[PDB]
Design a protein around this ligand. Structure first.
Ligand SMILES: O=C(NCc1ccc(O)cc1)c1cc(O)c(=O)c2c(O)c(O)ccc2c1
Ligand SMILES: [Mg+2]
Ligand SMILES: [Mn+2]
Length: 182
Protein backbone atom coordinates (compact mmCIF):
# COMPACT_ATOMS: atom_id res chain seq x y z
CA UNK A 1 0.00 0.00 0.00
CA UNK A 2 1.77 3.09 -1.36
CA UNK A 3 4.54 4.26 -3.69
CA UNK A 4 8.33 4.22 -3.57
CA UNK A 5 7.93 8.00 -3.91
CA UNK A 6 6.25 7.91 -0.48
CA UNK A 7 9.29 6.00 0.88
CA UNK A 8 11.46 8.77 -0.54
CA UNK A 9 9.18 11.36 1.10
CA UNK A 10 9.46 9.65 4.51
CA UNK A 11 13.25 9.53 4.36
CA UNK A 12 13.35 13.23 3.36
CA UNK A 13 10.62 14.50 5.72
CA UNK A 14 11.51 12.81 9.05
CA UNK A 15 14.76 12.84 11.00
CA UNK A 16 16.86 9.65 10.85
CA UNK A 17 16.17 8.68 14.49
CA UNK A 18 12.41 8.56 13.85
CA UNK A 19 12.91 6.75 10.53
CA UNK A 20 15.12 4.09 12.17
CA UNK A 21 12.55 3.51 14.97
CA UNK A 22 9.73 3.23 12.41
CA UNK A 23 11.65 0.70 10.30
CA UNK A 24 12.34 -1.37 13.44
CA UNK A 25 8.68 -1.36 14.54
CA UNK A 26 7.52 -2.51 11.11
CA UNK A 27 10.13 -5.28 10.78
CA UNK A 28 9.15 -6.49 14.25
CA UNK A 29 5.76 -7.45 12.75
CA UNK A 30 7.24 -8.78 9.52
CA UNK A 31 6.35 -5.75 7.35
CA UNK A 32 8.73 -4.07 4.89
CA UNK A 33 8.82 -0.23 5.00
CA UNK A 34 9.62 -0.23 1.25
CA UNK A 35 6.26 -1.96 0.65
CA UNK A 36 3.88 -0.63 3.28
CA UNK A 37 5.07 2.91 2.55
CA UNK A 38 1.89 4.52 3.90
CA UNK A 39 2.15 2.70 7.24
CA UNK A 40 5.83 3.75 7.26
CA UNK A 41 4.78 7.42 7.03
CA UNK A 42 2.01 7.02 9.61
CA UNK A 43 4.37 5.46 12.17
CA UNK A 44 6.95 8.24 11.62
CA UNK A 45 4.21 10.87 12.07
CA UNK A 46 2.98 9.39 15.35
CA UNK A 47 6.55 9.16 16.71
CA UNK A 48 7.27 12.74 15.69
CA UNK A 49 4.08 14.01 17.33
CA UNK A 50 4.88 12.14 20.57
CA UNK A 51 8.36 13.70 20.74
CA UNK A 52 7.05 17.19 19.86
CA UNK A 53 4.42 16.82 22.59
CA UNK A 54 7.09 15.90 25.15
CA UNK A 55 9.03 19.13 24.34
CA UNK A 56 5.79 21.09 24.71
CA UNK A 57 5.78 22.02 28.40
CA UNK A 58 8.32 22.70 31.16
CA UNK A 59 11.74 21.05 31.61
CA UNK A 60 11.08 17.31 32.12
CA UNK A 61 7.36 17.84 32.47
CA UNK A 62 6.92 14.61 30.48
CA UNK A 63 8.50 11.17 30.44
CA UNK A 64 8.55 9.61 26.97
CA UNK A 65 7.42 5.98 26.77
CA UNK A 66 6.75 5.62 23.03
CA UNK A 67 9.84 4.91 20.90
CA UNK A 68 11.58 2.92 23.68
CA UNK A 69 12.23 -0.81 23.42
CA UNK A 70 9.63 -2.84 25.33
CA UNK A 71 11.81 -3.64 28.36
CA UNK A 72 12.79 0.01 28.90
CA UNK A 73 9.21 1.23 28.22
CA UNK A 74 7.77 -1.04 30.94
CA UNK A 75 10.69 -0.19 33.22
CA UNK A 76 9.65 3.46 32.92
CA UNK A 77 5.98 2.65 33.40
CA UNK A 78 6.46 0.33 36.42
CA UNK A 79 8.83 2.85 38.04
CA UNK A 80 6.31 5.70 37.70
CA UNK A 81 3.42 3.48 38.89
CA UNK A 82 5.50 2.41 41.90
CA UNK A 83 6.62 5.99 42.66
CA UNK A 84 3.36 7.95 42.12
CA UNK A 85 0.94 5.13 42.96
CA UNK A 86 -1.04 5.54 39.69
CA UNK A 87 -2.65 2.38 38.30
CA UNK A 88 -0.58 0.11 36.03
CA UNK A 89 -2.01 0.32 32.47
CA UNK A 90 -2.78 -2.81 30.46
CA UNK A 91 -0.98 -1.38 27.40
CA UNK A 92 2.03 0.91 27.00
CA UNK A 93 0.89 4.58 26.82
CA UNK A 94 2.92 7.23 24.99
CA UNK A 95 3.89 9.75 27.71
CA UNK A 96 3.59 10.36 31.41
CA UNK A 97 2.65 13.84 32.61
CA UNK A 98 4.42 14.69 35.91
CA UNK A 99 2.43 17.91 36.39
CA UNK A 100 -0.97 16.22 36.07
CA UNK A 101 0.15 12.76 37.30
CA UNK A 102 -1.45 10.83 34.44
CA UNK A 103 -0.37 8.74 31.47
CA UNK A 104 -1.17 10.09 28.01
CA UNK A 105 -2.19 8.21 24.89
CA UNK A 106 -1.49 10.15 21.70
CA UNK A 107 -3.42 9.46 18.51
CA UNK A 108 -2.76 10.78 15.01
CA UNK A 109 -5.43 10.04 12.39
CA UNK A 110 -6.19 10.78 8.74
CA UNK A 111 -9.84 9.99 9.57
CA UNK A 112 -12.32 11.91 11.75
CA UNK A 113 -11.08 12.62 15.28
CA UNK A 114 -14.18 11.51 17.22
CA UNK A 115 -14.00 8.07 15.59
CA UNK A 116 -10.36 7.54 16.60
CA UNK A 117 -10.86 8.99 20.10
CA UNK A 118 -13.60 6.42 20.63
CA UNK A 119 -11.49 3.53 19.32
CA UNK A 120 -8.75 4.54 21.79
CA UNK A 121 -11.19 4.67 24.70
CA UNK A 122 -12.36 1.13 23.81
CA UNK A 123 -8.82 -0.31 23.75
CA UNK A 124 -7.75 1.60 26.86
CA UNK A 125 -9.12 0.19 30.12
CA UNK A 126 -7.20 2.37 32.59
CA UNK A 127 -10.08 4.87 32.77
CA UNK A 128 -7.42 7.28 34.12
CA UNK A 129 -5.17 7.35 31.05
CA UNK A 130 -5.77 10.56 29.23
CA UNK A 131 -6.33 10.54 25.44
CA UNK A 132 -5.25 13.29 23.02
CA UNK A 133 -5.97 12.97 19.28
CA UNK A 134 -4.65 15.08 16.38
CA UNK A 135 -5.59 15.01 12.67
CA UNK A 136 -3.78 16.31 9.57
CA UNK A 137 -6.66 18.76 8.92
CA UNK A 138 -6.35 20.71 12.18
CA UNK A 139 -9.00 18.97 14.28
CA UNK A 140 -8.00 18.11 17.81
CA UNK A 141 -9.66 16.35 20.68
CA UNK A 142 -8.81 15.38 24.26
CA UNK A 143 -10.37 13.76 27.31
CA UNK A 144 -12.69 16.12 29.23
CA UNK A 145 -11.57 18.86 26.79
CA UNK A 146 -8.31 19.04 28.77
CA UNK A 147 -5.64 19.65 26.12
CA UNK A 148 -2.73 19.51 28.56
CA UNK A 149 -0.38 21.86 26.68
CA UNK A 150 -0.81 25.58 26.06
CA UNK A 151 -2.24 26.75 22.72
CA UNK A 152 1.16 27.69 21.27
CA UNK A 153 2.57 24.16 21.72
CA UNK A 154 -0.53 22.53 20.26
CA UNK A 155 -0.88 24.94 17.31
CA UNK A 156 2.59 23.96 16.38
CA UNK A 157 1.98 20.22 16.33
CA UNK A 158 -1.13 20.96 14.29
CA UNK A 159 0.90 23.13 11.91
CA UNK A 160 3.56 20.44 11.47
CA UNK A 161 0.85 17.88 10.55
CA UNK A 162 -0.65 20.40 8.14
CA UNK A 163 2.74 20.90 6.49
CA UNK A 164 3.17 17.12 6.08
CA UNK A 165 -0.27 16.80 4.42
CA UNK A 166 0.53 19.67 2.03
CA UNK A 167 3.94 18.29 1.00
CA UNK A 168 2.35 14.89 0.45
CA UNK A 169 -0.41 16.55 -1.61
CA UNK A 170 2.13 18.36 -3.79
CA UNK A 171 3.68 14.93 -4.48
CA UNK A 172 0.30 13.26 -5.16
CA UNK A 173 0.73 10.97 -2.13
CA UNK A 174 -2.05 12.40 0.06
CA UNK A 175 -5.05 10.55 -1.36
CA UNK A 176 -3.40 7.12 -1.06
CA UNK A 177 -2.12 8.01 2.43
CA UNK A 178 -5.55 9.31 3.50
CA UNK A 179 -7.44 6.17 2.44
CA UNK A 180 -4.82 3.71 3.71
CA UNK A 181 -5.72 3.98 7.42
CA UNK A 182 -7.14 0.85 9.08
O1 LIG B 1 0.30 -1.65 16.23
C1 LIG B 1 1.24 -1.46 17.00
N1 LIG B 1 2.28 -2.29 16.98
C2 LIG B 1 2.33 -3.42 16.06
C3 LIG B 1 2.71 -3.10 14.64
C4 LIG B 1 3.76 -2.23 14.34
C5 LIG B 1 4.16 -2.00 13.03
C6 LIG B 1 3.49 -2.61 11.99
O2 LIG B 1 3.86 -2.40 10.69
C7 LIG B 1 2.41 -3.44 12.26
C8 LIG B 1 2.05 -3.70 13.57
C9 LIG B 1 1.19 -0.33 17.97
C10 LIG B 1 2.02 -0.37 19.11
C11 LIG B 1 2.22 0.62 20.07
O3 LIG B 1 3.12 0.38 21.11
C12 LIG B 1 1.64 1.95 20.22
O4 LIG B 1 2.04 2.52 21.22
C13 LIG B 1 0.64 2.64 19.31
C14 LIG B 1 0.24 3.98 19.57
O5 LIG B 1 0.67 4.81 20.58
C15 LIG B 1 -0.70 4.63 18.75
O6 LIG B 1 -1.05 5.91 19.06
C16 LIG B 1 -1.24 3.99 17.66
C17 LIG B 1 -0.88 2.69 17.37
C18 LIG B 1 0.07 2.01 18.17
C19 LIG B 1 0.34 0.66 17.65
MG1 LIG C 1 2.27 4.38 21.75
MN1 LIG D 1 -0.17 6.55 20.52
Amino acid sequence: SGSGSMEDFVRQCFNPMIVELAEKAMKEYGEDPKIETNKFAAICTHLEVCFMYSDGGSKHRFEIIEGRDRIMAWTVVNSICNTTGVEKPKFLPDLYDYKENRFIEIGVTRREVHIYYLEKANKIKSEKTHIHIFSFTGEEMATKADYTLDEESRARIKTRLFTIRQEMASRSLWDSFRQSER
